[PDB]
PDB file of C-alpha atoms in Angstrom:
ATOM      1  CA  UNK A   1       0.000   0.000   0.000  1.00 59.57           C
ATOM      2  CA  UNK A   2       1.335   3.449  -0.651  1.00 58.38           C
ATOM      3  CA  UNK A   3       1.134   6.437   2.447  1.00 61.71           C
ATOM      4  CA  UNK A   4       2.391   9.641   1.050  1.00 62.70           C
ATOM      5  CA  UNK A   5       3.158  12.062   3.387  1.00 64.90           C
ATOM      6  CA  UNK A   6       3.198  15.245   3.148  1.00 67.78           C
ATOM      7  CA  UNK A   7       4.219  17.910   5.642  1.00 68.05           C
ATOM      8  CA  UNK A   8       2.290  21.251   4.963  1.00 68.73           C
ATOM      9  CA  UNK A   9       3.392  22.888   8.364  1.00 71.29           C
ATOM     10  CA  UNK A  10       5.808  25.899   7.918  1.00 72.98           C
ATOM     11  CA  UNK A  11       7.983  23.951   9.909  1.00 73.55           C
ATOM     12  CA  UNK A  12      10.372  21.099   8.787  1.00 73.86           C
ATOM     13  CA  UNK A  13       8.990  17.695  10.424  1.00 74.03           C
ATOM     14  CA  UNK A  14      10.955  13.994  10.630  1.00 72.12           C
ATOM     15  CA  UNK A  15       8.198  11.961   9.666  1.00 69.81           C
ATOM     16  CA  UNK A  16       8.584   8.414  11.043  1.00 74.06           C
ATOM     17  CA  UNK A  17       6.541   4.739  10.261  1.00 75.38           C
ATOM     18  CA  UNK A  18       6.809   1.969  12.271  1.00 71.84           C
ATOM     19  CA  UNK A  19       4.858  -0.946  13.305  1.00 76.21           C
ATOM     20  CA  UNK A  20       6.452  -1.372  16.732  1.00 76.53           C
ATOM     21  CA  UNK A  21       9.044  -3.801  16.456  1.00 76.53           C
ATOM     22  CA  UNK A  22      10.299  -2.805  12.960  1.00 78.88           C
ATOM     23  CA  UNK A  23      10.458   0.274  10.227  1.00 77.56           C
ATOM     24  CA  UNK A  24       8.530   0.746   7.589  1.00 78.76           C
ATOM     25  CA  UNK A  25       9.703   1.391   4.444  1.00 78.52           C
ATOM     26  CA  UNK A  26      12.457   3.356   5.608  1.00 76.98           C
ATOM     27  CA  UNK A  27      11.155   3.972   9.001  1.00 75.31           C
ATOM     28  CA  UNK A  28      11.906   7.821   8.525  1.00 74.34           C
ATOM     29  CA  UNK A  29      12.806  10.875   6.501  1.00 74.44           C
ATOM     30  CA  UNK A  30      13.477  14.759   6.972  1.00 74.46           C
ATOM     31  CA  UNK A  31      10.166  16.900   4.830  1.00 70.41           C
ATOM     32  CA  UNK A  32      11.394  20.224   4.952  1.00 70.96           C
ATOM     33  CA  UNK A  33       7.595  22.712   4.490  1.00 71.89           C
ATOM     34  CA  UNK A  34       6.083  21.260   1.309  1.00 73.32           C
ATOM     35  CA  UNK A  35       7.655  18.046   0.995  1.00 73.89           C
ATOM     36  CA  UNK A  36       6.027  15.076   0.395  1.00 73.17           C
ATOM     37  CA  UNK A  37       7.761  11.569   0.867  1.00 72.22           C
ATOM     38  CA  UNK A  38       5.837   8.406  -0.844  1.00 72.21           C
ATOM     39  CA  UNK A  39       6.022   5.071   1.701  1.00 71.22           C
ATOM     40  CA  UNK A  40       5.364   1.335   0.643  1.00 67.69           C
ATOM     41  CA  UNK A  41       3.849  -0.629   3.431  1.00 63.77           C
ATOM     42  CA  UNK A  42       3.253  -4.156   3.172  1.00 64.87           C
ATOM     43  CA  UNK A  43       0.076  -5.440   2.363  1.00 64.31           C
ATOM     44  CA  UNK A  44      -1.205  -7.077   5.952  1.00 60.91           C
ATOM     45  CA  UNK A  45       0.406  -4.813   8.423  1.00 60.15           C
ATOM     46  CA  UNK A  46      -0.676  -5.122  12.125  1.00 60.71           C
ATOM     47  CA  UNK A  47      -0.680  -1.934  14.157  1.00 61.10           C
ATOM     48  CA  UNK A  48       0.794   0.445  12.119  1.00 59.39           C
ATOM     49  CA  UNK A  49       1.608   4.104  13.138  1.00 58.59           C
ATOM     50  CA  UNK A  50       2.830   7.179  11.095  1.00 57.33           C
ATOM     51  CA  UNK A  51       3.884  10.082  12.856  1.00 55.48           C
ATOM     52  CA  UNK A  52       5.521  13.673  12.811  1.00 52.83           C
ATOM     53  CA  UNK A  53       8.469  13.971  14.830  1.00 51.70           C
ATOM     54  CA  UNK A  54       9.871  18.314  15.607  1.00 49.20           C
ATOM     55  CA  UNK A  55      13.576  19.681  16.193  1.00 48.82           C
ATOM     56  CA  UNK A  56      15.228  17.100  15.133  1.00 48.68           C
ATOM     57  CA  UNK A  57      19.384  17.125  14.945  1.00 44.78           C
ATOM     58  CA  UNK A  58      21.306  14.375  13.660  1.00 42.47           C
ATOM     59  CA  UNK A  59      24.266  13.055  12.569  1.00 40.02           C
ATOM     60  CA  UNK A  60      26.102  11.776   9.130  1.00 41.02           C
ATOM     61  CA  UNK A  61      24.980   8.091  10.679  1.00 41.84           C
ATOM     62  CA  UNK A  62      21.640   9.306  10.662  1.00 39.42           C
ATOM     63  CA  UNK A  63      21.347   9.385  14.795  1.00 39.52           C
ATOM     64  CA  UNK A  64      20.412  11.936  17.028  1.00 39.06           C
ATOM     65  CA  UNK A  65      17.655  13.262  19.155  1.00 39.33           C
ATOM     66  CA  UNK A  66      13.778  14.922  18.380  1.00 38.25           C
ATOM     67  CA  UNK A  67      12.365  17.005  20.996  1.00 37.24           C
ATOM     68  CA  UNK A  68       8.829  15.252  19.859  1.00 38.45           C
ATOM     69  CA  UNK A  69       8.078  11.479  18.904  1.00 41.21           C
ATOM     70  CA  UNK A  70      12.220  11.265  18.982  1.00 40.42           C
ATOM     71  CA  UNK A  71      12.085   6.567  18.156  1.00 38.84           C
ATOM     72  CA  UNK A  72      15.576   6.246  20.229  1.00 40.56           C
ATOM     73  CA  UNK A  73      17.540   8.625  18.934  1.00 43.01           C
ATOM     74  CA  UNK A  74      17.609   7.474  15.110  1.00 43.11           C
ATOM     75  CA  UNK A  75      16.845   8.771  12.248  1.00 40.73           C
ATOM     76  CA  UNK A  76      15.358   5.644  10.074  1.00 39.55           C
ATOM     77  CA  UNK A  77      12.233   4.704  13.205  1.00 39.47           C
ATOM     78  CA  UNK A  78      12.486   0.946  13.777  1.00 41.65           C
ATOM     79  CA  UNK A  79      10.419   1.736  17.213  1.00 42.43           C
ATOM     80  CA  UNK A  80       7.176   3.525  18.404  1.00 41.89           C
ATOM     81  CA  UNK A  81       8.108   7.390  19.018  1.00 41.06           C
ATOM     82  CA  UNK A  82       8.376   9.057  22.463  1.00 41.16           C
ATOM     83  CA  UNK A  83       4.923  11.097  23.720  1.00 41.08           C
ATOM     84  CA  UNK A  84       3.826  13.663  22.716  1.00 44.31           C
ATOM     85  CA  UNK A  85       2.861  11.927  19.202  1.00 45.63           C
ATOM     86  CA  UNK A  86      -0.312  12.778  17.199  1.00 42.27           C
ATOM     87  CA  UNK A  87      -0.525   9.222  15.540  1.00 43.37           C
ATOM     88  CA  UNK A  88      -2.023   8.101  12.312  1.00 42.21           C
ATOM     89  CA  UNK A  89      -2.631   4.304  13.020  1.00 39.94           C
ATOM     90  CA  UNK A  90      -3.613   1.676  10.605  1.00 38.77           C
ATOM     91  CA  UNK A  91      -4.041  -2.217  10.281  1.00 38.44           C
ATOM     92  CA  UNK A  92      -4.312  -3.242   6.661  1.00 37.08           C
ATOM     93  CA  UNK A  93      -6.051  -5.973   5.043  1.00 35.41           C
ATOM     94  CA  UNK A  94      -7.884  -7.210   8.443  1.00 32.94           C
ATOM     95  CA  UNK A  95      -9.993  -9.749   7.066  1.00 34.20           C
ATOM     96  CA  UNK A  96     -10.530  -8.117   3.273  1.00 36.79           C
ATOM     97  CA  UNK A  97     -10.181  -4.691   4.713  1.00 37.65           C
ATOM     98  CA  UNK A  98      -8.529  -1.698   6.385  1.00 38.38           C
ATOM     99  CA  UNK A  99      -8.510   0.031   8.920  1.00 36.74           C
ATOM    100  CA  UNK A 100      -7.352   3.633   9.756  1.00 38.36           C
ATOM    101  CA  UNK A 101      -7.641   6.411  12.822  1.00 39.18           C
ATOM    102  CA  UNK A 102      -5.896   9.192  14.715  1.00 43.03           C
ATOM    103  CA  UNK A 103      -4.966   9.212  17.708  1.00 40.41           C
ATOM    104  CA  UNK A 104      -4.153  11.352  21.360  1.00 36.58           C
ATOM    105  CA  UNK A 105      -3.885   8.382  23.097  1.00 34.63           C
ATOM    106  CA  UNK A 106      -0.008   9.268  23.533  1.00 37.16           C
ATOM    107  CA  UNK A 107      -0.406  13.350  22.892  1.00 35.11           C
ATOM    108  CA  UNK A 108      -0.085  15.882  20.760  1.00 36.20           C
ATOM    109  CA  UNK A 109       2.592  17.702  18.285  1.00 36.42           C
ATOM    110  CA  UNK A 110       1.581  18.628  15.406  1.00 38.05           C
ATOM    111  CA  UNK A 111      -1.947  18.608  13.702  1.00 38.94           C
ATOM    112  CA  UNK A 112      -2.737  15.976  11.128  1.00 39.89           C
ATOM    113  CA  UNK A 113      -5.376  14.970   8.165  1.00 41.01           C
ATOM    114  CA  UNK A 114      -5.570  10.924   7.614  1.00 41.51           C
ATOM    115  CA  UNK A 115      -7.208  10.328   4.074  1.00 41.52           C
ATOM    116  CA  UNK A 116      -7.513   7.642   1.395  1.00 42.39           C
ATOM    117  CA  UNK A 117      -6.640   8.364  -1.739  1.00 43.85           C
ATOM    118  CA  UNK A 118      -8.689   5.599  -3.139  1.00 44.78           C
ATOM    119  CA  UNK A 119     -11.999   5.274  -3.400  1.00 44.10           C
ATOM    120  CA  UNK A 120     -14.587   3.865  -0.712  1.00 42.20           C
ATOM    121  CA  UNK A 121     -14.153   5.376   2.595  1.00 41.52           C
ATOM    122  CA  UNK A 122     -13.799   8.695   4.033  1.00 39.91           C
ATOM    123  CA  UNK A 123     -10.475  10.580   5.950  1.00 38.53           C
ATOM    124  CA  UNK A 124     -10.134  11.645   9.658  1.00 39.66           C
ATOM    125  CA  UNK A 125      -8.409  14.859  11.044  1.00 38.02           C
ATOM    126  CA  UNK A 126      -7.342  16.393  14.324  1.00 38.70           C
ATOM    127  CA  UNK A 127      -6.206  19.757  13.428  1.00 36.70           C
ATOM    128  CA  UNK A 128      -7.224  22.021  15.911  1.00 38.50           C
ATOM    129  CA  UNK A 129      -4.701  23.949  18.158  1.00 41.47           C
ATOM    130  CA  UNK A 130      -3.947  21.586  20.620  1.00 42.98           C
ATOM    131  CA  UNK A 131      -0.572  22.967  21.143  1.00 38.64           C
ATOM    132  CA  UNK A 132      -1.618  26.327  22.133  1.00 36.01           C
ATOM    133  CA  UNK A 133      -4.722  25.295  23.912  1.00 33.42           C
ATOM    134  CA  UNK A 134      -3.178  22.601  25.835  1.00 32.93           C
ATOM    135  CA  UNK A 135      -3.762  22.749  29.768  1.00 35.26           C
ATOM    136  CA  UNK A 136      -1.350  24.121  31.825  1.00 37.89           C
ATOM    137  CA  UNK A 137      -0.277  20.413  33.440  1.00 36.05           C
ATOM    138  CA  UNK A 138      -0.510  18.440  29.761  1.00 36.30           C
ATOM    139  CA  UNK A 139       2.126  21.294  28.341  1.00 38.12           C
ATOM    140  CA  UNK A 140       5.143  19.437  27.447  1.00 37.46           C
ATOM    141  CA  UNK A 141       8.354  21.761  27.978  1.00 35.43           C
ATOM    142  CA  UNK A 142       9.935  19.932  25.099  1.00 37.37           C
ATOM    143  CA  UNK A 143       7.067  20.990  22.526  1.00 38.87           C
ATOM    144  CA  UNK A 144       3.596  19.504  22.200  1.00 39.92           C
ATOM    145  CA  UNK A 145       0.796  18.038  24.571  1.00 42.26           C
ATOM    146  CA  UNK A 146       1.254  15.291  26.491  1.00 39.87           C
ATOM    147  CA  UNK A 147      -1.815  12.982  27.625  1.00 37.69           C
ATOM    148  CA  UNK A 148      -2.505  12.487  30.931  1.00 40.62           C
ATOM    149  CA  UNK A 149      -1.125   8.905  30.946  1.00 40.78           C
ATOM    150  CA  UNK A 150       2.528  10.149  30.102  1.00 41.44           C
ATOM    151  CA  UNK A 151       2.274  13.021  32.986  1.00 41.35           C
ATOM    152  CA  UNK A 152       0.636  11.042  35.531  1.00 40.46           C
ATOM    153  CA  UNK A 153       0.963   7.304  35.037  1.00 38.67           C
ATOM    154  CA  UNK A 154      -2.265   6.279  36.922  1.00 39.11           C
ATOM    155  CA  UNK A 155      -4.570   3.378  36.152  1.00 37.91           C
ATOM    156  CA  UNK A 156      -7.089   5.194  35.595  1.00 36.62           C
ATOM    157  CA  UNK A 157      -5.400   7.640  32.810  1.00 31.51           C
ATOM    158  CA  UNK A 158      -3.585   5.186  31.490  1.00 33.64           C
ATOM    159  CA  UNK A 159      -6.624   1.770  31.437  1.00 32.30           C
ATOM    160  CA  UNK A 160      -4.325  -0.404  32.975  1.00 33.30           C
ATOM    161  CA  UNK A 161      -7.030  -2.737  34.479  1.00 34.53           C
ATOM    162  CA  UNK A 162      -9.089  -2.384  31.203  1.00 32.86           C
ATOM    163  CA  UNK A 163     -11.891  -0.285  33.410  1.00 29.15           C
ATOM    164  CA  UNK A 164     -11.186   3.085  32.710  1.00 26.21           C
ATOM    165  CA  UNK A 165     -13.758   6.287  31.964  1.00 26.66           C
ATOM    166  CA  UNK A 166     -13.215   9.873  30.245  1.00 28.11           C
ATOM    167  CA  UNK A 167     -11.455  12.222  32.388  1.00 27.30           C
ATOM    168  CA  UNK A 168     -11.256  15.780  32.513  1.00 30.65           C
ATOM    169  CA  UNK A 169      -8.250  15.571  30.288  1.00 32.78           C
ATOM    170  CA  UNK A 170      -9.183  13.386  27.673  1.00 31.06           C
ATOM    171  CA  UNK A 171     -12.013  15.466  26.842  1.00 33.51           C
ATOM    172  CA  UNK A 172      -9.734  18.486  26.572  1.00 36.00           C
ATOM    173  CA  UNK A 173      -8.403  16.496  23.382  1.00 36.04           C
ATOM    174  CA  UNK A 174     -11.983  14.874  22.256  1.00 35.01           C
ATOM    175  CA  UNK A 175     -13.215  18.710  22.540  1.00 32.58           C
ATOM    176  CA  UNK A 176     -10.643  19.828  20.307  1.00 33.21           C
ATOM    177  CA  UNK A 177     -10.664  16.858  18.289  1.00 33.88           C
ATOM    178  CA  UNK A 178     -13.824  14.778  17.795  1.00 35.51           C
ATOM    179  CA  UNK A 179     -12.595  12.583  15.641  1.00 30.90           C
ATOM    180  CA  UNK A 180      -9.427  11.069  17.275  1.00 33.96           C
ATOM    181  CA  UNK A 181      -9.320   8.770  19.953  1.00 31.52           C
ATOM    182  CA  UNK A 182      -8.720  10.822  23.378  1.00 34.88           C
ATOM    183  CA  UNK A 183      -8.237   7.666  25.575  1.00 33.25           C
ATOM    184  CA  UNK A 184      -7.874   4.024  25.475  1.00 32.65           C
ATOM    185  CA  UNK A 185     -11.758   3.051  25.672  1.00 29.40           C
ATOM    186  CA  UNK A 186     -13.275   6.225  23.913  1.00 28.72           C
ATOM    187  CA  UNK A 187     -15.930   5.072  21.874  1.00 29.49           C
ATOM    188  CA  UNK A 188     -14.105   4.019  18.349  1.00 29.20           C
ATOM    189  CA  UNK A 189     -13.633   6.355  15.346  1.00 27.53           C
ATOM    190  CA  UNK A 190     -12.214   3.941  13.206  1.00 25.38           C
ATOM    191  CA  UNK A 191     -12.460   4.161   9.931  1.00 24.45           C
ATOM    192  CA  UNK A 192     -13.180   0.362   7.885  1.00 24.77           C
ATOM    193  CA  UNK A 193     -11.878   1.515   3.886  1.00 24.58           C
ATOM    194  CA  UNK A 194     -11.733  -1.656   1.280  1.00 25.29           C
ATOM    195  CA  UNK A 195      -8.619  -3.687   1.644  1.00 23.82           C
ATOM    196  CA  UNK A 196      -5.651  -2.722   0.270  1.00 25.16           C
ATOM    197  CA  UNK A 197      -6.450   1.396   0.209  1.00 26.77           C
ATOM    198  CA  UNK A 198      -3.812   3.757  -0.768  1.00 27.36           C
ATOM    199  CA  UNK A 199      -3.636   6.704   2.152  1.00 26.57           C
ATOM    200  CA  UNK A 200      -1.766  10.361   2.208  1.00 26.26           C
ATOM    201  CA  UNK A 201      -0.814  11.463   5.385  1.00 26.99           C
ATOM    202  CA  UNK A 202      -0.942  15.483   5.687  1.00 25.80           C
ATOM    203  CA  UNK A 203       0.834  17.168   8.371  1.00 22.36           C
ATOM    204  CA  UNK A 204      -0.745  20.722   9.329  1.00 22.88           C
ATOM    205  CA  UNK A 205      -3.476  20.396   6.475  1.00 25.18           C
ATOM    206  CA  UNK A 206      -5.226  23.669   7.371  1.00 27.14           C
ATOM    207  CA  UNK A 207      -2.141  25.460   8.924  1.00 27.68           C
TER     208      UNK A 207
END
């Protein structure tokens, strides 16, 4: 399946894929404002996640650090990203279909559209200003909002026992952003597209 990803923030952004335990495609890739970067992501992939990553350095060996969604300090993400990461997440021919949603399960950086490019289903976007809205105890000093999970590490924040409810701060997020997930059991807004959909992935697509 093909992601392109495009970063329309003013901003550069290290975009990053990964499926948890390995890269995909390349795993990552500097988009300086403007730049889009096709993927290839194999047909049948389990718990996807693309993701933005913001003030990035690295080196000629391609490691470093991000002060958002940094994936252990390298360049090409073989890992998940550190929180605060607005995450487009996707599992891909589930049963003869796919699969896609956004996320603030693990924060917010930077603001996102999800879309297919193909026909048959419809996209998802958080693009509000969560940044600059972001409660006082969610601001991350690094850049971005974190959830409450990250800041506080309770059971109830973070659903450790399964049992969990809405919270003041996940419906700082859902307010902002209806159709991302603002904690572990919020009710679902998955999207189901046909099997095998192509997506693009737009960074800041109103800003």
């Amino acid at each position: 399946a093909t992601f392109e990803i495009v970063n329309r923030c003013s901003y550069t952004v290290w975009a990053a894929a990964s499926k948890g335990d390995a890269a995909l495609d390349a795993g990552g890739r500097q988009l300086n404002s403007g730049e889009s970067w096709t993927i290839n992501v194999e047909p049948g992939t389990k718990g996807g996640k693309i993701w933005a990553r913001t003030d990035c350095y690295f080196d000629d060996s391609g490691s470093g650090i991000c002060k958002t969604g940094d994936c252990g300090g390298l360049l090409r993400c073989k890992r998940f990203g550190r929180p605060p990461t607005t995450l487009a997440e996707f599992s891909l021919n589930q049963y003869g279909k796919d699969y896609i949603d956004i996320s603030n399960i693990k924060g917010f950086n930077v603001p996102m559209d999800f879309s297919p490019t193909t026909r048959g289903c419809r996209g998802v976007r958080c693009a509000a200003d969560i940044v600059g809205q972001c409660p006082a105890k969610l601001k991350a000093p690094g850049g971005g909002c974190n959830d409450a999970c990250t800041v506080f590490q309770t059971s109830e924040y973070c659903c450790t026992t399964g049992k969990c409810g809405p919270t003041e701060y996940s419906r700082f997020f859902k307010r902002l952003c209806p159709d991302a997930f603002s904690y572990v059991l919020d009710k679902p807004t998955t999207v189901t597209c046909p099997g095998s959909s192509n997506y693009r992935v737009t960074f800041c697509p109103t800003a």
